A paper describes a structure:
To gain insight into the role of the basic cluster in stabilizing S-coatomer interactions, we generated alanine mutants of α[name] Arg13, Lys15, and Arg300, which are equivalent to the β‘[name] basic cluster residues Arg15, Lys17, and Arg272, respectively. Finally, the Lys15Ala mutant did not bind to either the wild-type or clientized Thr1273Glu S heptapeptides, and a 1.6 Å resolution crystal structure revealed this was due to conformational occlusion of the α[name] binding site by an inward rotation of nearby Arg13 and His31 side chains, rather than loss of Lys15 interactions. L Superposition of wild-type (white) and Lys15Ala mutant (yellow) crystal structures shows substantial perturbation and inward rotation of Arg13 and His31 side chains in the mutant to block the S heptapeptide binding site. We therefore generated wild-type and clientized Thr1273Glu S heptapeptides with amidation at the C-terminal main chain carboxylate, which neutralizes the main chain charge that interacts with α[name] Lys15. This approach does not perturb the binding site architecture of α[name], unlike mutagenesis. Loss of α[name] binding was observed for the amidated wild-type S heptapeptide but not the amidated clientized Thr1273Glu S heptapeptide. In contrast, Arg13 and Lys15 residues in α[name] provide the basis for basal binding to both wild-type and clientized S molecules.
Hence, this loss of critical proteins has the potential to compromise ER proteostasis and generate cellular stress. This challenge to normal metabolism is overcome by the activity of the cytosolic coatomer protein I ([name]) polymer, whose repeating unit is the coatomer, a 560 kDa complex of seven distinct gene products (α-, β-, β′-, γ-, δ-, ε-, and ζ-[name])25–31. Overall, the coatomer functions to retrieve the escaped “client” proteins, such as type I membrane proteins, from cis-Golgi back to ER by retrograde trafficking. In particular, the S protein – a type I membrane protein – is delivered to the ERGIC from both the ER (by anterograde trafficking) and the Golgi (by retrograde trafficking)3,10–12. Here we utilize recombinant [name]-[name]-2 S proteins and tail peptides, including constructs with enhanced mimicry of the coatomer binding motif (clientized S protein), to elucidate the atomic structure of the S-coatomer interface.
Author numbering: 1 to 171, 200 to 331
The structure:
């Protein structure tokens, strides 16, 4: 495969990127505490947002409201209105670095996870913490809402991936369903497929693991092997039978979803990769690395 780069930002180390679902925008969150809003079709900086001290690793748009959420090493979860360009309020409660924060697609909820070993669920209408998900025994490096079921997946340096049943909160509010064992070092990332009943996880063992789930059980399908340093992030291609991963070995790797064999490696000479994301609808990807952010399309070689 070939990478067709659409946009690049040069900066100090970036930690998170988020695609706007309908505008040609990305948010980027940086190790210097600042958040950038970029139009990647024109190459223009639209705005800058300063509400944190220290790295900002969590960043996400709400799918339909004019809001975004950020999460920092200062322990804050900040909720912003990008149309009025205001910091609306801070959700306080985490006791160590915030690693990931996202919005739910239907309920008025924000998810955040932290080095304090908890996942918190917040109601952004009431501004209250509505649930604290405890049970991990080391940093919680990632968490995600399922796109169509009342489930969360989380990844921890305790070497587990947990799937949590949150149907009680929708209506005990949160109960652990699966404690997925398989990684033999800390887990840095976890992801759901948007339409198939699959989960990806990756971490310090250099492995990307693929899991399948039903309502009643889960199992490990296979492993993508090859990265030669910590894997920072992994995701499913929403529309092609492909897995993507990004690593401190300075590569983005593409793998076959059905055989887990390597398809293509993309390398940077001097930059570790920290995060990758995919647009929900478009064949558009973004990656955060030591020297900034890139937005790219993926095409078949010699197309």
């Amino acid at each position: 495969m070939e990478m067709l780069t659409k946009f690049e930002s040069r900066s100090s180390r970036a930690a998170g990127v988020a695609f706007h679902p309908t505008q040609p925008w990305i948010l980027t969150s940086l190790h210097n505490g600042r958040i950038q809003l970029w139009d990647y079709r024109m190459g223009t900086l639209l705005d800058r947002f300063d509400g944190h001290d220290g790295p900002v690793r969590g960043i996400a748009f709400h799918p339909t409201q004019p809001l975004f959420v950020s999460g920092g090493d200062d322990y804050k979860v900040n909720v912003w209105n990008y149309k009025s360009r205001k910091l609306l309020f801070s959700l306080c409660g985490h006791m160590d670095y915030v690693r990931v924060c996202t919005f739910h697609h239907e309920y008025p909820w924000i998810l955040s996870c932290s080095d304090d070993q908890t996942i918190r669920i917040w109601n952004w209408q009431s501004r209250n913490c509505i649930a604290i998900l405890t049970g991990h025994s080391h940093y919680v490096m990632c968490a995600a809402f399922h796109p169509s079921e009342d489930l969360i997946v989380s990844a921890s340096l305790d070497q587990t991936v947990r799937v949590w049943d949150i149907s009680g909160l929708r209506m005990t509010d949160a109960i652990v369903k699966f404690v997925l064992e398989g990684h033999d070092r800390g887990v840095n990332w976890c992801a759901f497929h948007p339409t198939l009943p699959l989960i990806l996880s990756a971490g310090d063992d250099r492995l990307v693991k693929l899991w399948r789930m039903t309502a009643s059980k889960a199992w490990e399908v296979d492993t993508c092997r090859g990265h030669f340093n910590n894997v920072s992030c992994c995701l499913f291609h929403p529309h092609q039978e492909l897995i993507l991963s990004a690593s401190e070995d300075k590569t983005i790797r593409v793998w076959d979803l059905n055989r887990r064999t390597a398809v293509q490696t993309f390398r940077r000479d001097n930059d570790r990769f920290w995060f990758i994301t995919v647009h929900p609808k478009l064949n558009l990807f973004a990656a955060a690395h030591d020297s900034g952010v890139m937005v790219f399309k993926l095409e078949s070689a010699w197309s």
